[PDB]
Amino acid sequence: DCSPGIWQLDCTHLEGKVILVAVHVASGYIEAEVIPAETGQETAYFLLKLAGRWPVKTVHTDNGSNFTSTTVKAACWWAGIKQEFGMNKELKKIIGQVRDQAEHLKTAVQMAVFIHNKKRKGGIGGYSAGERIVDIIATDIQ
Amino acid sequence: DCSPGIWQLDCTHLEGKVILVAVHVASGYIEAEVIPAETGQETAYFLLKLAGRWPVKTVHTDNGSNFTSTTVKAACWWAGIKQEFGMNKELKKIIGQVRDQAEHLKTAVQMAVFIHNKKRKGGIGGYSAGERIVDIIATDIQ
Numbered sequence A, B: 001d002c003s004p005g006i007w008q009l010d011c012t013h014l015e016g017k018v019i020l021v022a023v024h025v026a027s028g029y030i031e032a033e034v035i036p037a038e039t040g041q042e043t044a045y046f047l048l049k050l051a052g053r054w055p056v057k058t059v060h061t062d063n064g065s066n067f068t069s070t071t072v073k074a075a076c077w078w079a080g081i082k083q084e085f086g087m088n089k090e091l092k093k094i095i096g097q098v099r100d101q102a103e104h105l106k107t108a109v110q111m112a113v114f115i116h117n118k119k120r121k122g123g124i125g126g127y128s129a130g131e132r133i134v135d136i137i138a139t140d141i142q
Helices: A040-053 A070-079 A088-098 A105-118 A129-138 B040-053 B070-079 B088-098 B105-118 B129-138
Strands: A006-014 A017-024 A029-035 A058-060 B006-014 B017-024 B029-035 B058-060
Touching (some): A006 A040, A029 A040, A029 A105, A029 A129, B006 B040, B006 B088, B017 B040, B017 B105, B029 B040, B029 B105, B029 B129, B088 B105, B105 B129
Parallel strands (some): B006 B058
Antiparallel strands (some): B006 B017, B017 B029
16 A cells, blocks of 8 residues: 555554554554553554564554654654554454453454454455565565 | 574563563564563463464474463464474673663663664675565565
8 A cells, every 4th residue: 555664553442451553554464462551651662663573664643642752752763763654443353253262352462463464365466464564575665 | 594484482581570582593583572470371472473473383492391381382272383493692782782772671672673683684695684584484485
């Protein structure tokens, strides 16, 4: 969809807890983490992990206040990430479906991420989001 | 070095805390997490996240007792991971170097992972571990 270095990052709420969700816009690849509460500290930490794993250039969110803390700005500065774009409902569904097999929300979320990233799109060039991100980035794009 | 689906997973100790470290044997790519204590619960959770991100087939460790819990076995079973192979000192050094700039061990570890995964090997085909893993997997190997 967009440039290989573009990511979307938002927080979802479930069972009182908060689920931090990062989506690689161009591939549909998801990466998530369950955290106690929405704090700049947690967002900054998550951004750093994402940055050391993929070539993160820009991150966009649907709630700008999410990135106003000095903690976040500090993480972005160090990692060389700039703001604004330069599967939450589905994921929530899969979590709901798998929540029985999982003994905790954390597990259910990671089971849902696994499922989502592995599901091959039945069609032309039927790849999975997990495969797509690797390919997209492999082509020295990001 | 080895097959694209092979990973090494061990726990390191620093400042009282435990650092879970996963290394993609064939690329040198590292992925880490700082945790309170070495428990099967934490190892199982980490394995699940790694599995939904990369095509993890086999995981090896230097301490077999690390994978004897039913919790771990349960994670491996669900994710389809089998045992035994089918940069900790360097990382520890980088952490030591960056620990000043980082306000917490967690941050220093993620800064060290970023640094390690991004450092291009000055030589023939000078790629970074981060680039190597993507390429290795991109070639539909794993």
